[PDB]
Design a protein around this ligand. Sequence first.
Ligand SMILES: N=C(N)N/N=C/c1ccc(Cl)cc1
Ligand SMILES: N=C(N)N/N=C/c1ccc(Cl)cc1
Ligand SMILES: N=C(N)N/N=C/c1ccc(Cl)cc1
Ligand SMILES: N=C(N)N/N=C/c1ccc(Cl)cc1
Ligand SMILES: N=C(N)N/N=C/c1ccc(Cl)cc1
Lengths: 391, 391, 391, 391, 391
Amino acid sequence: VTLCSPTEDDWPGMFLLAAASFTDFIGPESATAWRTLVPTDGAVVVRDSEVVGMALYMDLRLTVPGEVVLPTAGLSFVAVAPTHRRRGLLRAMCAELHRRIADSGYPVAALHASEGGIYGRFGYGPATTLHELTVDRRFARFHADAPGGSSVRLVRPTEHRGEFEAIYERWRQQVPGGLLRPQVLWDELLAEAKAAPGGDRESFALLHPDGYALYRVDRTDLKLARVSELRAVTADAHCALWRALIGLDSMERISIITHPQDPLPHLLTDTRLARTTWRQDGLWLRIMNVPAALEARGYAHEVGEFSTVLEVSDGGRFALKIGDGRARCTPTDAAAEIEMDRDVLGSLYLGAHRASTLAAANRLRTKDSQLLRRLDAAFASDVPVQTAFEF
Amino acid sequence: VTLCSPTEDDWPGMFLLAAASFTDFIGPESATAWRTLVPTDGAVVVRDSEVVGMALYMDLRLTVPGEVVLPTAGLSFVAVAPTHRRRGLLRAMCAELHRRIADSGYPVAALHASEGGIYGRFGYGPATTLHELTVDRRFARFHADAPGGSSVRLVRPTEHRGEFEAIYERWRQQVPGGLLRPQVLWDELLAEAKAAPGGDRESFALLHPDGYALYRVDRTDLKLARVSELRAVTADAHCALWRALIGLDSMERISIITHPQDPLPHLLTDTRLARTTWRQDGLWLRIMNVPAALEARGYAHEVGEFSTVLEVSDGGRFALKIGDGRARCTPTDAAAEIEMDRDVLGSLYLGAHRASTLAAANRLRTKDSQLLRRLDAAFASDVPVQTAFEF
Amino acid sequence: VTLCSPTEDDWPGMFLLAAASFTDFIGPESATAWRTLVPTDGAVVVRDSEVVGMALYMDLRLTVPGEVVLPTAGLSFVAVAPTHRRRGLLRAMCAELHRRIADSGYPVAALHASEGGIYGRFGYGPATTLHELTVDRRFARFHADAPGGSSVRLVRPTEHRGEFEAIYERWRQQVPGGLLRPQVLWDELLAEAKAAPGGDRESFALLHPDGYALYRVDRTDLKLARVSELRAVTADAHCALWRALIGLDSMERISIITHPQDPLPHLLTDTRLARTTWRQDGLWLRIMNVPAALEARGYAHEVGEFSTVLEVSDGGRFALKIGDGRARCTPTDAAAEIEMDRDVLGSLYLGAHRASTLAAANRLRTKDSQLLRRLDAAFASDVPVQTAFEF
Amino acid sequence: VTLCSPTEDDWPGMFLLAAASFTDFIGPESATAWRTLVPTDGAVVVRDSEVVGMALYMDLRLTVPGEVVLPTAGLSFVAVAPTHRRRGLLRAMCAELHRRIADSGYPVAALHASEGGIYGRFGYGPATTLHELTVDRRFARFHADAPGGSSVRLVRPTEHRGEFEAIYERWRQQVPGGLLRPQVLWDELLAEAKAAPGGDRESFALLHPDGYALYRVDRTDLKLARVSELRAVTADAHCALWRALIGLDSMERISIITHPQDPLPHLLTDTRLARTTWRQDGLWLRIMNVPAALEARGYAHEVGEFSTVLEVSDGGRFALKIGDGRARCTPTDAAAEIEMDRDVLGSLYLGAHRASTLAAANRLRTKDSQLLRRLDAAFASDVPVQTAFEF
Amino acid sequence: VTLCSPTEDDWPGMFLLAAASFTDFIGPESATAWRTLVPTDGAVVVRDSEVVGMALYMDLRLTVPGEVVLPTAGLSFVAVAPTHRRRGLLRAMCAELHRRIADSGYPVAALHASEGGIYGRFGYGPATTLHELTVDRRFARFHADAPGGSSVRLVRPTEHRGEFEAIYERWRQQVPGGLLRPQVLWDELLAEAKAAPGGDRESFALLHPDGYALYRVDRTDLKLARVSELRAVTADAHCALWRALIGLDSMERISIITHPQDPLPHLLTDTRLARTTWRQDGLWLRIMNVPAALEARGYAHEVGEFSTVLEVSDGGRFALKIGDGRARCTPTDAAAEIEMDRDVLGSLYLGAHRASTLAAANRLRTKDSQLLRRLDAAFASDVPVQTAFEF
Ligand SMILES: N=C(N)N/N=C/c1ccc(Cl)cc1
Ligand SMILES: N=C(N)N/N=C/c1ccc(Cl)cc1
Ligand SMILES: N=C(N)N/N=C/c1ccc(Cl)cc1
Ligand SMILES: N=C(N)N/N=C/c1ccc(Cl)cc1
Ligand SMILES: N=C(N)N/N=C/c1ccc(Cl)cc1
């Protein structure tokens, strides 16, 4: 077996492995569109003749707390042939891509995990949380304080692409976890909005000046509407879109994959009607360069200036000073006051997990509880961390 | 219909209404034990001859952030006869008890809600969050950093009451949401630990010096262990108890009703194995006296001294100054900078809900986003808010 | 918002609202075929630019007891945008169409209800009952008295359209609830008989000289045959068709949506094998002109001549004389002996509901129990009321 | 009604009856391919004008113990119209085909039964056993003794037809129950390997020099892989293919329809992981000529030479001498020592059922238990009996 | 931790561990009855004070092919505390008991496995197969050849103990897998025949001179009868009991845990009605003394005298000569012709698994296929191997 960047001849072998590895495999036409986001030298294959392993990264733009946009390597299309398990192919492919990603100057890498047990050992920590809410809309009544209660319009998605793009572009710059969505991914999204024979039903859009929702009736449960995407840049837009969705009088239930701080439950007289039916890790982060990443993000202005020494396991030791919402992170050989594996740092980085929660599991070690409270407060995000789209 | 404090003659009528209203009705013997927590004048009934409505409160001790214990009126045993719906009996009973509770000098009242849509209009806000985790323990592997890995012992609950009481007493003083558990409730708890013919199976305990877990196999799902209660006063105890529970090799799944900040997922190599299968409002709070409650709790030392004017709808207007983890809350007629209904204040009070989340739903109105960030940070609890026991 | 008859430009907006409102939306091609049954001025839309509401009626021919055929306005394609709920659009559209229907000279209007709680307040009463029977055909044995036991032929529906049309035309003239089925609806029916990729399986027909049955295997339950339509003009045809359906030896169960008086159960040695698995209101009637409707239908010859005074709430007061199977219904200011809302009259009109049953619910008020027995007997239909097809 | 060989004009009527009788009806194009295996005079129809009944046989080659290949008449496409049940059409069609099959010189006939209760009375006995194994591959660990542990390759079925054909041809000559698979059935098999809109997903192949496996993800259960076919000519190939299938890391379960003696369970440390989820009769045999069939197959060399008298009910009486793995079977009027119906002989013939098991049900009568042990041992197959493909 | 034989003081600790380890724990009274089958020094415990591990064996009598009864050590009541997993307690307890069992002169040990993956590494091989048949008795029709068709009587189990004991005693001496059932186990069995509040329903018996069946209606499925035990010493008794069970006209289905060679399916016109709904390893055997065990059992008289050299991994090497249904097994240092682990020998020993099946998984290695056929034939049992009762 040998690991190398793939030639044009390798791509049919990669699509076969893809088709056999991913049940949601988007097919060669869609794969060729996503491929435009893969830089030169962004892919590796392992051949035995035939492709027995592959992995690549895409050039992405990730919003982190403080409305800072980082260049991000988005790992994807990772597969090992069922014939070549337990031969260290994944470890070999991840090592080679991480080397290329670091040499290319990316401060962070990111992925969506097919399983929860794989990516921790390669330095990836879960950094966003997916939260499915299911609303029994037959009982849903909006609170007297709820904004609104004719600003929203029912429209065909393909006829209002420009308006969706503009709303999304405002949303992603404003929200930690936001990703730039390139033209090819808008092409792919609005192609999925069409009904398929023996497949998904037709998608409809609810369009507001400052938000949109894309939804479709479930294939088999004809009383369930699934919201594929709701992007709202104001509270008024968010409420107005939910009033319109609760107006889907032929539906019994409306489902959406959102974030833990979604205010929908508080818009209703009965907060319990917005049931949490599913929770899962969303985006995973590997901090490639600790000082670059720590200095790039904004921090909470509320916590007072403090200094400490952070040691990342096989990742370096730093004098970390945080004050006025900014961090300075410099090399030191001074005694560490905080230790953690690289994956734990990825989990803290966007504000989704509390340092004190990770400390309680001993994933993060300090002998100073005041330092723990200060890390918690400083790494907290004012804007709740959200998940943009799966890649 | 007339509302009055119940005579000894009313109690058989109250037990009949109880039996018809609560499917989990604990029966007259248990009810008579709980009754010892109801003060003189703690109960109201509405008669038509027969009891058509009832409500009472118990004297409770609630731990709030800063390890401060408040006297708390715990509303319970609230029922209206199916024959007397929509005659304002609940509104009449809640008004009379709230008057008695306020005149008695309780700064807060609390309850567990049978439905989510009832108690908001009487000034109760959900203040704790129940989070059910289900672990597929056949795949569960503890992380290398996980504490431990013979400190825990498998024991009969009834033989180690004193040790459970001592651990719980340490736990409840330390944790916001903690309740003092009186002797009668320990009597009731250890009586539920026995197997019942056609009922629950036998309960077992896992006992550590600094924690315990009570669990039983599910009646019908014989591969499910349900943890009724896990109290751990150290991280070492929490991990050691979970190592023992993952050691229940005849079980496929272990379930527990915990809090959102439970560190269990981070103790495992695969965080996804600890699945969130259910979420619900736990304890509801009504702030009876805004200045007494706001001044009693501790606040985050991290946020800098700040002053504002809080107006509670039909609850008064206050100059609120927070600094050095303490609040001063005094009458003012100065212009309000923050407005909210009383229920919203109950929801912020223990740190379970963010002011900025409630603002996004317009349940909390200010024109200052800096003030919002300061409220969020100040009302945050360093110790995660937990739910003690249902009443 | 404005209500007006739709221009050709409005129809794409109407199809979008249709697609978003009706999960069974037949698509623009089918909708354009049904549209040929909508008279000039038969449709209304409410615009905000975009279509936020619509409703129309079709010209139909309804058979009522006595084999009398009434011109009937069939309301259909009624939708309000999820963005424009609770603004009285439905009430405004129903008022305008009812005005047009009454001015056009229709004695009755009719509809199929998407929900049971909407149409009562606009004067529509449920007038037919759908009764689903499921037969476990593996145990089905025909009684010795059962007619028959090679008159039926298994055929391709598209090759015997003329024979189906002729049988249906005889059936609909003979049966209360019968509707004339125009050529476009035969086009649509025999187009649904074809298998669809990821859709329904192929339909087969059982053809007798005096009856037919159309059936198909269920998409997902491959041991269930669903009879979409069985029309039999003689008892011999009905039995012969059921012998052939019980002969579907690869099926475990045969299902059909029929009427409560279907004799199938009595054709078998075990009447219990024909299980009632579902019941629902079928056709709803609004009597537009009380005297025209009451005088048009035939009445039971068995009841002796009787006279009374019927008052319809906001519908007039009439001297009603019934004798020799005919009614005379004339204006009066004499004291009412019977009162009911207009919807109740629609429910009595085809013989599906007993006056004494509606009296027991106080939907129909009289102080004379003899009058009640006479109404029951007179309004009864000798031919059981059936449902023709959904519109 | 009349029974006759079908003209070219009869075939559209036969396809209509097929479509109405077989939910898995392969359609006219596929039926026309299978039709190439039906000899002249291989089919009968019963007409009333229209086709109310049909049955045919195909020319097949069946491997029986001793690696002997018999010409075999494969009955198929048997249907009676639901309109013509209980008129003896099946009995009339089976009698006519059996006459033709016997006159043509076939020693055995065979079929796959749509139900278990039909074919016994026409002399067919179930002769192979289908055994579905479902493996929870997440727990599957191969035993230290298991062969292997990169010989298998993941490939597209349509690109390796020649290799599949060659492996199958070696397999079918070696295994009792093996059938020659003609070119048209390879055409049909590799056409089913393609994904269908609203139908089955894409098939993949695992290819070894001495075995192959064809599998696809289940349409609705996306964590289930179904192996449609695994053919292995060596133990090494069988183990290597199962290592590759257990490597389908995105699947929770792998299912296969195999035979009772499949060694898969013994390849794993936990034999229980290979769960038997389904069992059913596979191939049914009717021995057309008792002496020809008994003399054609090989017998166990282990049992010593023995002689007996076998009487088949309405099938003749024979002096049966078995020695050195060969039988001689000659006419006799000597007293019978063994009696059985013809169907019982079909059940013994390939070694799937023990004579002593059928004796215990009195399907096989002797007064000599030594004779029973000798029949059991002699009729046993060294190579386990398997099922080739459904027809 | 220390391993030692338990004192009377240890038994409450053992019952606590039992209650926490076995959901079907029979309780202290039943455990005390089973305890009478445990010899002096038959039990081991591991203490830390408290019991963290236990294992014992009972003195049993096992019937093996040739109607030979072996003294057998029945391992049971094996548990490790959930607090003491992965400390080698099981390995330590099994080593100590195996030493005692071997020194005591038992030629074999046996157990029922709670999981399939544990006992192979301690030399236990699965030796019997449990086969659940479920009959849809509404379609069940007995074949014309079926024996019988008033010999069976419906009776109360507790009134016919003597008759059950006598039938069972005849059965167990005759059948490989048979166990002597001592008086205490008859006490326990007929105590389980009584209905329990919130537990199993009442058991009934069907009694024949040469067989009995004990059955009860399922707790929750009231159309399912479960046969707990059917013992028949003649084919006539077996058929007569099944005629009576198919006569349970209020039941839809009859279920029984039987063996793979149960003739029930062949008693019916439709063999498919007896569905295999479950299969699992029953009794596991560890051959403690290879020569004693191999020489004790009878072998098939059909296979000719043959000699070979068997090597058991860490179990010795033997010259094995089999002829006239007897084996001689003597020490040798001659080259091995057959090798296998000890567990594989346990799996062959009662005739449930074929040597050629285990060879195909490479659990059994030889370079002689003739030797394999001879082992298969010789180790085969004329009487099908059955499972007596769980211990
Ligand atoms: N569609 C997704 N959820 N991820 N797809 C990512 C992808 C990236 C690169 C290639 Cl070449 C193909 C696919
Ligand atoms: N057992 C509970 N979950 N709540 N029970 C509270 C209660 C309080 C007072 C009386 Cl008199 C009876 C019951
Ligand atoms: N197919 C139905 N069940 N009802 N469809 C009625 C309809 C009537 C008019 C138009 Cl323009 C479109 C559809
Ligand atoms: N595809 C099958 N499982 N059996 N199909 C057999 C067949 C045989 C002859 C004709 Cl003409 C059509 C079909
Ligand atoms: N009831 C069973 N299935 N096995 N029980 C075996 C047992 C053996 C010894 C003791 Cl001390 C307790 C129980």
